[PDB]
Design a protein around this ligand. Structure first.
Ligand SMILES: [K+]
Length: 128
């Protein structure tokens, strides 16, 4: 599913991301835009052989099991395919564990390079 901007903001807020660990809702929407273009089905292979899954491009090296990343961990204890469903619940709950691991939203390269330090509130401007 390809979310709309305001559709995604509302679902992220319902699932507890607004100001989660201090990051306002606009940061998560901006991150999703540049990680996945709001597409729940986005997948992207990493040079080390791991894969990024879903709306927040969560990495199988540490967080989910795809059965094809040797020597990886599954810290969210889910199949990476759960991160691709139209329901973002699994992506959000795993994102919460990622952002709580010590580096905040710097875990998402797109956030550090394209959202950090910008007017991220614009991403939720106009939404109900
Ligand atoms: K932080």
């Amino acid at each position: 599913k390809v979310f709309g901007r305001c559709e995604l903001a509302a679902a992220m807020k319902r699932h507890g991301l607004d100001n989660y660990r201090g990051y306002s809702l606009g940061n998560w929407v901006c991150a999703a835009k540049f990680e996945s273009n709001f597409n729940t089905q986005a997948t992207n292979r990493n040079t080390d052989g791991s894969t990024d899954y879903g709306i927040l491009q969560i990495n199988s090296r540490w967080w989910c099991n795809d059965g094809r990343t040797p020597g990886s961990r599954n810290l969210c204890n889910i199949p990476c395919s759960a991160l691709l469903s139209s329901d973002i619940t699994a992506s959000v709950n795993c994102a919460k564990k990622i952002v709580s691991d010590g580096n905040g939203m710097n875990a998402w390269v797109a956030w550090r390079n394209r959202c950090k330090g910008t007017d991220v509130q614009a991403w939720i401007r106009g939404c109900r």
